[PDB]
């Protein structure tokens, strides 16, 4: 038997409760590949799935965890064999299927990628869906012409996961990064990741009447969404793009079309969950080359399975800095 | 001397009036190239500049007309000589500079393009800024992977200028075009342009509470904006893009970020006004080959300078079908 975080739901009271429980291999959903999980992480979406559900969890009891990395234990698919090091992010794992908050997980072979060279399984989860998506966002901006030397690139919710990794990647690629944070005490941390400007949240997180403000930003990786995204759109330089990643400041987008029509601004939707295998490989290879591992290390907050209920609540309140690494085998 | 539409403003009352007046060459702003205008057209923006101003006209009296096509009369720039056929769209002509509603116009040589071999000056204005921007929008969709055979392409405000040209181009390129109109009597016209489905405006011009509806549209050329655009975003297929062109339905964008985040949808801002010379040439050559001239002909509504005050008022009310061609030399 082995340990896993299991969320139960009482339909009478609606109450969800997460707790570490002991499971057997026959408790997992049937799957092509059984992975001995070494690490997982805590993404914003994991906080939803650990706690209230956010409408993302269709079946209880539920083992959350949209990410894991580990070593293949058994496989009926010729792409993977015992001993292979593999990485899972997304594919609705941790939402519609039991996930990485477990010492063992069963998955479709289509859902895995090989552990990218340059990362161990710990670092792969230090990156996580959050860091993987920051890379996708940077790639989207590059695809639309972003190059260094043309003004600051805005990173919103910068003290969090997506924001920390995007800051580190963009700084390493030679960009001037303006980091937006509601936690001013993280400035030194953000500067150590490579940020060149620190922007207070309350300077940019409300809409204004004017549909256009001055052109400031050469591009943006947005983990916040909401009214902040609406405001940022009116501050983009001509032809610049926003990579839309997050909704931590709200799902509503109270925008105007004026920045798009008058300045050729783009709003580029970034979905990590259903990325094709080939682009997953591409983004992970970019991560191994362009995310300095010493910068990644500075983001890591260690945790165990027993820490997940509290960390899930913390991340939804915006109180997790950097990137949690869950050692599902600790002790 | 020569005829032109002149708009005057009473700066006390703020009211404007437009009428045909007789001007001399020295009434025009100084310019590098004097063009004997043959045709202009009526764009939505021209309706603003003919009438209330829309905040776009810095100086009165004003000769409006953001577009013209005609024959060079004199030039101090080696790029153009007397007899050359030339096309002007945008570059703030008709807004910050006297424009095409005149038998003669002075312009910077930077602002012109040579008339494509496949268009005459009448056809170039039947296309106009509206049709030129429709082509830019199609090009943006193709640059983001739009190809035929992957679902209908939505064209909003289809009975108008942008919409009519987008419908005809997309249909000729092999797409199934869904044409959104608030004028149901234009259905047969839209079908004659190549539309395969007719969508009533009131079916799609309100927001809904659900942030995602079913995936339907392979792409969209949007002349309407407003709540219609917000609704359309939740109906785009995974990875599909909206080319944002217009705001005829309102400048506000009461959207959510959910289609961007969960479906990788893109909102791509199209600006015709300041397109670089090289891209203008490519768009015009695309127009010459991808817009059937008999389809364009079915869009044309002939006009003279004296018709412009009424047509400017009409287009702002959504009451112009197709593409006005103004013969500034009519007898
Ligand atoms: N589209 C995808 O595939 C994809 C992949 C990963 C994440 N996402 C989304 O991206 C967002 C970030 O994920 P994450 O794991 O990095 O979570 P996170 O660590 O909590 O990052 C979010 C940051 O946003 C800021 N923030 C929180 N609440 C805010 C508010 N009300 N107003 C303004 N800023 C606020 C906080 O940073 P500061 O303290 O620095 O202000 C917070 O740390 C989430 O919404 C998540 O769902 C989507
Ligand atoms: N970004 C650029 O560079 C650029 C270039 C050209 C045009 N634009 C803009 O694109 C839009 C269209 O220009 P246009 O010259 O083609 O004008 P247009 O001929 O009047 O076309 C607009 C069409 O939109 C529909 N419409 C009007 N009011 C509406 C409303 N309240 N709700 C829903 N639909 C409405 C009408 O079509 P139906 O009768 O079929 O419903 C109308 O004919 C304008 O907003 C214009 O400013 C921008």
PDB file of N, CA and C in Angstrom, chain B residues 69-138:
ATOM      1  N   UNK B  69      -8.344  57.092 -54.898  1.00  0.00           N
ATOM      2  CA  UNK B  69      -7.517  56.540 -55.965  1.00  0.00           C
ATOM      3  C   UNK B  69      -7.596  57.488 -57.147  1.00  0.00           C
ATOM      4  N   UNK B  70      -6.484  57.659 -57.854  1.00  0.00           N
ATOM      5  CA  UNK B  70      -6.490  58.553 -58.999  1.00  0.00           C
ATOM      6  C   UNK B  70      -5.157  58.588 -59.712  1.00  0.00           C
ATOM      7  N   UNK B  71      -4.922  59.673 -60.442  1.00  0.00           N
ATOM      8  CA  UNK B  71      -3.744  59.796 -61.292  1.00  0.00           C
ATOM      9  C   UNK B  71      -2.869  60.942 -60.796  1.00  0.00           C
ATOM     10  N   UNK B  72      -1.568  60.673 -60.645  1.00  0.00           N
ATOM     11  CA  UNK B  72      -0.654  61.706 -60.171  1.00  0.00           C
ATOM     12  C   UNK B  72      -0.639  62.861 -61.157  1.00  0.00           C
ATOM     13  N   UNK B  73      -0.789  64.070 -60.631  1.00  0.00           N
ATOM     14  CA  UNK B  73      -0.735  65.289 -61.423  1.00  0.00           C
ATOM     15  C   UNK B  73       0.631  65.958 -61.356  1.00  0.00           C
ATOM     16  N   UNK B  74       1.258  65.973 -60.181  1.00  0.00           N
ATOM     17  CA  UNK B  74       2.592  66.536 -60.025  1.00  0.00           C
ATOM     18  C   UNK B  74       3.253  65.880 -58.824  1.00  0.00           C
ATOM     19  N   UNK B  75       4.581  65.774 -58.874  1.00  0.00           N
ATOM     20  CA  UNK B  75       5.301  65.134 -57.784  1.00  0.00           C
ATOM     21  C   UNK B  75       6.715  65.686 -57.667  1.00  0.00           C
ATOM     22  N   UNK B  76       7.125  65.961 -56.430  1.00  0.00           N
ATOM     23  CA  UNK B  76       8.504  66.303 -56.107  1.00  0.00           C
ATOM     24  C   UNK B  76       9.275  65.114 -55.545  1.00  0.00           C
ATOM     25  N   UNK B  77       8.696  63.923 -55.600  1.00  0.00           N
ATOM     26  CA  UNK B  77       9.323  62.708 -55.108  1.00  0.00           C
ATOM     27  C   UNK B  77       9.505  61.752 -56.280  1.00  0.00           C
ATOM     28  N   UNK B  78      10.704  61.167 -56.386  1.00  0.00           N
ATOM     29  CA  UNK B  78      11.046  60.342 -57.540  1.00  0.00           C
ATOM     30  C   UNK B  78      10.186  59.090 -57.643  1.00  0.00           C
ATOM     31  N   UNK B  79       9.497  58.703 -56.567  1.00  0.00           N
ATOM     32  CA  UNK B  79       8.698  57.483 -56.605  1.00  0.00           C
ATOM     33  C   UNK B  79       7.482  57.608 -57.513  1.00  0.00           C
ATOM     34  N   UNK B  80       7.026  58.823 -57.795  1.00  0.00           N
ATOM     35  CA  UNK B  80       5.803  59.007 -58.559  1.00  0.00           C
ATOM     36  C   UNK B  80       5.997  60.121 -59.570  1.00  0.00           C
ATOM     37  N   UNK B  81       5.444  59.917 -60.752  1.00  0.00           N
ATOM     38  CA  UNK B  81       5.506  60.881 -61.837  1.00  0.00           C
ATOM     39  C   UNK B  81       4.102  61.120 -62.366  1.00  0.00           C
ATOM     40  N   UNK B  82       3.889  62.233 -63.069  1.00  0.00           N
ATOM     41  CA  UNK B  82       2.579  62.490 -63.677  1.00  0.00           C
ATOM     42  C   UNK B  82       2.139  61.327 -64.550  1.00  0.00           C
ATOM     43  N   UNK B  83       0.879  60.932 -64.392  1.00  0.00           N
ATOM     44  CA  UNK B  83       0.319  59.813 -65.105  1.00  0.00           C
ATOM     45  C   UNK B  83       0.261  58.523 -64.309  1.00  0.00           C
ATOM     46  N   UNK B  84       1.034  58.408 -63.231  1.00  0.00           N
ATOM     47  CA  UNK B  84       0.978  57.193 -62.421  1.00  0.00           C
ATOM     48  C   UNK B  84      -0.380  57.055 -61.739  1.00  0.00           C
ATOM     49  N   UNK B  85      -0.944  55.846 -61.787  1.00  0.00           N
ATOM     50  CA  UNK B  85      -2.167  55.533 -61.056  1.00  0.00           C
ATOM     51  C   UNK B  85      -1.798  55.110 -59.640  1.00  0.00           C
ATOM     52  N   UNK B  86      -2.451  55.714 -58.644  1.00  0.00           N
ATOM     53  CA  UNK B  86      -2.061  55.536 -57.248  1.00  0.00           C
ATOM     54  C   UNK B  86      -3.289  55.360 -56.364  1.00  0.00           C
ATOM     55  N   UNK B  87      -3.062  54.750 -55.200  1.00  0.00           N
ATOM     56  CA  UNK B  87      -4.101  54.468 -54.216  1.00  0.00           C
ATOM     57  C   UNK B  87      -3.644  55.003 -52.866  1.00  0.00           C
ATOM     58  N   UNK B  88      -4.550  55.676 -52.159  1.00  0.00           N
ATOM     59  CA  UNK B  88      -4.315  56.136 -50.797  1.00  0.00           C
ATOM     60  C   UNK B  88      -5.380  55.534 -49.896  1.00  0.00           C
ATOM     61  N   UNK B  89      -4.952  54.826 -48.847  1.00  0.00           N
ATOM     62  CA  UNK B  89      -5.828  54.544 -47.722  1.00  0.00           C
ATOM     63  C   UNK B  89      -5.105  54.940 -46.444  1.00  0.00           C
ATOM     64  N   UNK B  90      -5.836  55.554 -45.515  1.00  0.00           N
ATOM     65  CA  UNK B  90      -5.324  55.723 -44.165  1.00  0.00           C
ATOM     66  C   UNK B  90      -4.246  56.776 -43.984  1.00  0.00           C
ATOM     67  N   UNK B  91      -3.232  56.467 -43.167  1.00  0.00           N
ATOM     68  CA  UNK B  91      -2.136  57.391 -42.862  1.00  0.00           C
ATOM     69  C   UNK B  91      -2.628  58.685 -42.223  1.00  0.00           C
ATOM     70  N   UNK B  92      -3.835  58.674 -41.656  1.00  0.00           N
ATOM     71  CA  UNK B  92      -4.509  59.801 -41.018  1.00  0.00           C
ATOM     72  C   UNK B  92      -5.024  60.802 -42.043  1.00  0.00           C
ATOM     73  N   UNK B  93      -4.893  60.516 -43.342  1.00  0.00           N
ATOM     74  CA  UNK B  93      -5.584  61.315 -44.349  1.00  0.00           C
ATOM     75  C   UNK B  93      -7.087  61.230 -44.100  1.00  0.00           C
ATOM     76  N   UNK B  94      -7.795  62.339 -44.335  1.00  0.00           N
ATOM     77  CA  UNK B  94      -9.205  62.405 -44.011  1.00  0.00           C
ATOM     78  C   UNK B  94      -9.515  62.600 -42.542  1.00  0.00           C
ATOM     79  N   UNK B  95      -8.496  62.613 -41.676  1.00  0.00           N
ATOM     80  CA  UNK B  95      -8.684  62.870 -40.250  1.00  0.00           C
ATOM     81  C   UNK B  95      -7.848  64.070 -39.834  1.00  0.00           C
ATOM     82  N   UNK B  96      -6.525  63.932 -39.844  1.00  0.00           N
ATOM     83  CA  UNK B  96      -5.581  64.980 -39.502  1.00  0.00           C
ATOM     84  C   UNK B  96      -5.121  65.767 -40.717  1.00  0.00           C
ATOM     85  N   UNK B  97      -5.459  65.302 -41.920  1.00  0.00           N
ATOM     86  CA  UNK B  97      -5.064  65.939 -43.164  1.00  0.00           C
ATOM     87  C   UNK B  97      -6.252  65.946 -44.106  1.00  0.00           C
ATOM     88  N   UNK B  98      -6.321  66.969 -44.954  1.00  0.00           N
ATOM     89  CA  UNK B  98      -7.355  66.985 -45.983  1.00  0.00           C
ATOM     90  C   UNK B  98      -7.256  65.744 -46.867  1.00  0.00           C
ATOM     91  N   UNK B  99      -8.412  65.241 -47.301  1.00  0.00           N
ATOM     92  CA  UNK B  99      -8.499  63.886 -47.796  1.00  0.00           C
ATOM     93  C   UNK B  99      -9.112  63.773 -49.183  1.00  0.00           C
ATOM     94  N   UNK B 100      -9.721  62.603 -49.422  1.00  0.00           N
ATOM     95  CA  UNK B 100     -10.097  62.181 -50.758  1.00  0.00           C
ATOM     96  C   UNK B 100     -11.395  62.743 -51.301  1.00  0.00           C
ATOM     97  N   UNK B 101     -12.165  63.489 -50.503  1.00  0.00           N
ATOM     98  CA  UNK B 101     -13.435  64.048 -50.976  1.00  0.00           C
ATOM     99  C   UNK B 101     -13.173  65.355 -51.728  1.00  0.00           C
ATOM    100  N   UNK B 102     -12.428  65.216 -52.814  1.00  0.00           N
ATOM    101  CA  UNK B 102     -11.934  66.365 -53.549  1.00  0.00           C
ATOM    102  C   UNK B 102     -11.450  65.887 -54.903  1.00  0.00           C
ATOM    103  N   UNK B 103     -11.559  66.755 -55.909  1.00  0.00           N
ATOM    104  CA  UNK B 103     -10.977  66.397 -57.193  1.00  0.00           C
ATOM    105  C   UNK B 103      -9.455  66.370 -57.138  1.00  0.00           C
ATOM    106  N   UNK B 104      -8.846  67.033 -56.160  1.00  0.00           N
ATOM    107  CA  UNK B 104      -7.397  67.063 -56.049  1.00  0.00           C
ATOM    108  C   UNK B 104      -7.013  66.909 -54.587  1.00  0.00           C
ATOM    109  N   UNK B 105      -5.946  66.150 -54.335  1.00  0.00           N
ATOM    110  CA  UNK B 105      -5.437  65.972 -52.982  1.00  0.00           C
ATOM    111  C   UNK B 105      -3.915  65.964 -53.002  1.00  0.00           C
ATOM    112  N   UNK B 106      -3.328  66.611 -52.000  1.00  0.00           N
ATOM    113  CA  UNK B 106      -1.890  66.632 -51.789  1.00  0.00           C
ATOM    114  C   UNK B 106      -1.553  65.697 -50.636  1.00  0.00           C
ATOM    115  N   UNK B 107      -0.510  64.886 -50.815  1.00  0.00           N
ATOM    116  CA  UNK B 107      -0.141  63.871 -49.832  1.00  0.00           C
ATOM    117  C   UNK B 107       1.368  63.682 -49.835  1.00  0.00           C
ATOM    118  N   UNK B 108       1.882  63.125 -48.733  1.00  0.00           N
ATOM    119  CA  UNK B 108       3.253  62.632 -48.707  1.00  0.00           C
ATOM    120  C   UNK B 108       3.392  61.424 -49.625  1.00  0.00           C
ATOM    121  N   UNK B 109       4.527  61.332 -50.321  1.00  0.00           N
ATOM    122  CA  UNK B 109       4.723  60.178 -51.191  1.00  0.00           C
ATOM    123  C   UNK B 109       4.736  58.879 -50.394  1.00  0.00           C
ATOM    124  N   UNK B 110       5.215  58.923 -49.145  1.00  0.00           N
ATOM    125  CA  UNK B 110       5.198  57.754 -48.265  1.00  0.00           C
ATOM    126  C   UNK B 110       3.817  57.139 -48.124  1.00  0.00           C
ATOM    127  N   UNK B 111       2.764  57.913 -48.354  1.00  0.00           N
ATOM    128  CA  UNK B 111       1.414  57.475 -48.050  1.00  0.00           C
ATOM    129  C   UNK B 111       0.757  56.716 -49.190  1.00  0.00           C
ATOM    130  N   UNK B 112       1.316  56.775 -50.391  1.00  0.00           N
ATOM    131  CA  UNK B 112       0.691  56.176 -51.559  1.00  0.00           C
ATOM    132  C   UNK B 112       1.151  54.734 -51.751  1.00  0.00           C
ATOM    133  N   UNK B 113       0.388  53.999 -52.554  1.00  0.00           N
ATOM    134  CA  UNK B 113       0.874  52.763 -53.161  1.00  0.00           C
ATOM    135  C   UNK B 113       0.515  52.829 -54.639  1.00  0.00           C
ATOM    136  N   UNK B 114       1.304  52.223 -55.517  1.00  0.00           N
ATOM    137  CA  UNK B 114       0.893  52.131 -56.920  1.00  0.00           C
ATOM    138  C   UNK B 114      -0.346  51.258 -57.059  1.00  0.00           C
ATOM    139  N   UNK B 115      -1.233  51.665 -57.960  1.00  0.00           N
ATOM    140  CA  UNK B 115      -2.416  50.874 -58.281  1.00  0.00           C
ATOM    141  C   UNK B 115      -2.016  49.486 -58.768  1.00  0.00           C
ATOM    142  N   UNK B 116      -2.493  48.414 -58.131  1.00  0.00           N
ATOM    143  CA  UNK B 116      -2.184  47.061 -58.611  1.00  0.00           C
ATOM    144  C   UNK B 116      -2.675  46.833 -60.033  1.00  0.00           C
ATOM    145  N   UNK B 117      -1.936  45.998 -60.762  1.00  0.00           N
ATOM    146  CA  UNK B 117      -2.291  45.699 -62.146  1.00  0.00           C
ATOM    147  C   UNK B 117      -3.717  45.170 -62.274  1.00  0.00           C
ATOM    148  N   UNK B 118      -4.194  44.421 -61.279  1.00  0.00           N
ATOM    149  CA  UNK B 118      -5.492  43.774 -61.333  1.00  0.00           C
ATOM    150  C   UNK B 118      -6.684  44.586 -60.871  1.00  0.00           C
ATOM    151  N   UNK B 119      -6.506  45.876 -60.600  1.00  0.00           N
ATOM    152  CA  UNK B 119      -7.579  46.754 -60.156  1.00  0.00           C
ATOM    153  C   UNK B 119      -7.539  48.033 -60.973  1.00  0.00           C
ATOM    154  N   UNK B 120      -8.706  48.594 -61.291  1.00  0.00           N
ATOM    155  CA  UNK B 120      -8.713  49.979 -61.747  1.00  0.00           C
ATOM    156  C   UNK B 120      -8.993  50.892 -60.550  1.00  0.00           C
ATOM    157  N   UNK B 121      -8.921  52.216 -60.771  1.00  0.00           N
ATOM    158  CA  UNK B 121      -9.069  53.125 -59.633  1.00  0.00           C
ATOM    159  C   UNK B 121     -10.472  53.057 -59.040  1.00  0.00           C
ATOM    160  N   UNK B 122     -11.475  52.728 -59.858  1.00  0.00           N
ATOM    161  CA  UNK B 122     -12.824  52.540 -59.335  1.00  0.00           C
ATOM    162  C   UNK B 122     -12.885  51.324 -58.412  1.00  0.00           C
ATOM    163  N   UNK B 123     -12.343  50.198 -58.865  1.00  0.00           N
ATOM    164  CA  UNK B 123     -12.341  48.993 -58.039  1.00  0.00           C
ATOM    165  C   UNK B 123     -11.522  49.184 -56.767  1.00  0.00           C
ATOM    166  N   UNK B 124     -10.416  49.934 -56.845  1.00  0.00           N
ATOM    167  CA  UNK B 124      -9.595  50.155 -55.653  1.00  0.00           C
ATOM    168  C   UNK B 124     -10.394  50.845 -54.552  1.00  0.00           C
ATOM    169  N   UNK B 125     -11.295  51.753 -54.929  1.00  0.00           N
ATOM    170  CA  UNK B 125     -12.116  52.416 -53.927  1.00  0.00           C
ATOM    171  C   UNK B 125     -13.355  51.616 -53.549  1.00  0.00           C
ATOM    172  N   UNK B 126     -13.881  50.790 -54.457  1.00  0.00           N
ATOM    173  CA  UNK B 126     -14.899  49.827 -54.055  1.00  0.00           C
ATOM    174  C   UNK B 126     -14.380  48.943 -52.932  1.00  0.00           C
ATOM    175  N   UNK B 127     -13.097  48.597 -52.985  1.00  0.00           N
ATOM    176  CA  UNK B 127     -12.469  47.890 -51.870  1.00  0.00           C
ATOM    177  C   UNK B 127     -12.343  48.828 -50.672  1.00  0.00           C
ATOM    178  N   UNK B 128     -11.580  49.909 -50.834  1.00  0.00           N
ATOM    179  CA  UNK B 128     -11.474  50.939 -49.815  1.00  0.00           C
ATOM    180  C   UNK B 128     -10.730  50.461 -48.578  1.00  0.00           C
ATOM    181  N   UNK B 129     -10.637  51.364 -47.595  1.00  0.00           N
ATOM    182  CA  UNK B 129     -10.122  50.959 -46.284  1.00  0.00           C
ATOM    183  C   UNK B 129     -10.879  49.751 -45.735  1.00  0.00           C
ATOM    184  N   UNK B 130     -12.200  49.710 -45.935  1.00  0.00           N
ATOM    185  CA  UNK B 130     -13.000  48.587 -45.438  1.00  0.00           C
ATOM    186  C   UNK B 130     -12.502  47.257 -45.989  1.00  0.00           C
ATOM    187  N   UNK B 131     -12.387  47.164 -47.314  1.00  0.00           N
ATOM    188  CA  UNK B 131     -11.994  45.914 -47.938  1.00  0.00           C
ATOM    189  C   UNK B 131     -10.530  45.603 -47.751  1.00  0.00           C
ATOM    190  N   UNK B 132      -9.688  46.634 -47.742  1.00  0.00           N
ATOM    191  CA  UNK B 132      -8.281  46.452 -47.417  1.00  0.00           C
ATOM    192  C   UNK B 132      -8.128  45.856 -46.021  1.00  0.00           C
ATOM    193  N   UNK B 133      -8.940  46.321 -45.072  1.00  0.00           N
ATOM    194  CA  UNK B 133      -8.837  45.819 -43.702  1.00  0.00           C
ATOM    195  C   UNK B 133      -9.402  44.411 -43.594  1.00  0.00           C
ATOM    196  N   UNK B 134     -10.465  44.120 -44.343  1.00  0.00           N
ATOM    197  CA  UNK B 134     -10.950  42.743 -44.427  1.00  0.00           C
ATOM    198  C   UNK B 134      -9.837  41.794 -44.873  1.00  0.00           C
ATOM    199  N   UNK B 135      -9.040  42.209 -45.860  1.00  0.00           N
ATOM    200  CA  UNK B 135      -7.925  41.378 -46.306  1.00  0.00           C
ATOM    201  C   UNK B 135      -6.874  41.223 -45.207  1.00  0.00           C
ATOM    202  N   UNK B 136      -6.505  42.328 -44.541  1.00  0.00           N
ATOM    203  CA  UNK B 136      -5.575  42.228 -43.415  1.00  0.00           C
ATOM    204  C   UNK B 136      -6.081  41.252 -42.365  1.00  0.00           C
ATOM    205  N   UNK B 137      -7.390  41.270 -42.097  1.00  0.00           N
ATOM    206  CA  UNK B 137      -7.960  40.375 -41.093  1.00  0.00           C
ATOM    207  C   UNK B 137      -7.836  38.917 -41.520  1.00  0.00           C
ATOM    208  N   UNK B 138      -8.174  38.625 -42.781  1.00  0.00           N
ATOM    209  CA  UNK B 138      -8.018  37.274 -43.320  1.00  0.00           C
ATOM    210  C   UNK B 138      -6.565  36.823 -43.224  1.00  0.00           C
TER     211      UNK B 138
END
